Amino acid sequence: GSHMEPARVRCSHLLVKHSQSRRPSSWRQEKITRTKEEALELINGYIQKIKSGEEDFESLASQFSDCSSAKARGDLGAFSRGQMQKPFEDASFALRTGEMSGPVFTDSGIHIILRTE
Numbered sequence: 001g002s003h004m005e006p007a008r009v010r011c012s013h014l015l016v017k018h019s020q021s022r023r024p025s026s027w028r029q030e031k032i033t034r035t036k037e038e039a040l041e042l043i044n045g046y047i048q049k050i051k052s053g054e055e056d057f058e059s060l061a062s063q064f065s066d067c068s069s070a071k072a073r074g075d076l077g078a079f080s081r082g083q084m085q086k087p088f089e090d091a092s093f094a095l096r097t098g099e100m101s102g103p104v105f106t107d108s109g110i111h112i113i114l115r116t117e
Contacts, residue, residue: 008078010117011092012057015067016042017109026066043103043110050100050114057114066109078117088113 017024017032018039024032034042046060061074069076081089087106091113095101100114 006117008080009092009115010078011076011088012061012074012114012116013067013069013076013088014043014046014057014061014065014074014112015069015106015109016046016064017066021108023108027068027070028066032066039110040103043112046112047100047102050112057112067111074114075116085111 016039017026017034018036019032019034020036021032026032042064046064049055049060050057058073058075062070065074076084081093084092085106087104088111091101091104092115095113095115097115097117100112104111104113
């Protein structure tokens with residue numbers, strides 16, 4: 001039924017940017033050469049790997065994430081709407097505990113959203 005909406009939710013986020021981006025400079029690569037096409041295929045692949053139970057999201061987010069998400073293993077912690085990236089926000093709050101969205105085209109690139117809570 002209608003469960004009370006949680007004030008704070010948490011999402012594990014992986015970011016795969018593209019060469020043509022607002023900032024193609026990350027903690028791993030100072031310059032990103034992969035094009036948008038690559039970014040998309042990478043995301044699509046990682047999603048399928050998470051679905052098949054190949055590798056842990058934490059491991060993936062600590063490796064193949066251009067964003068400094070590796071510091072928290074990809075975890076964003078308990079956050080609320082209004083303080084999150086808009087395309088990411090409406091995506092996270094559109095999921096549930098143990099749910100994962102698809103390629104979320106956000107500001108700097110595509111994010112994978114896996115909610116543990």
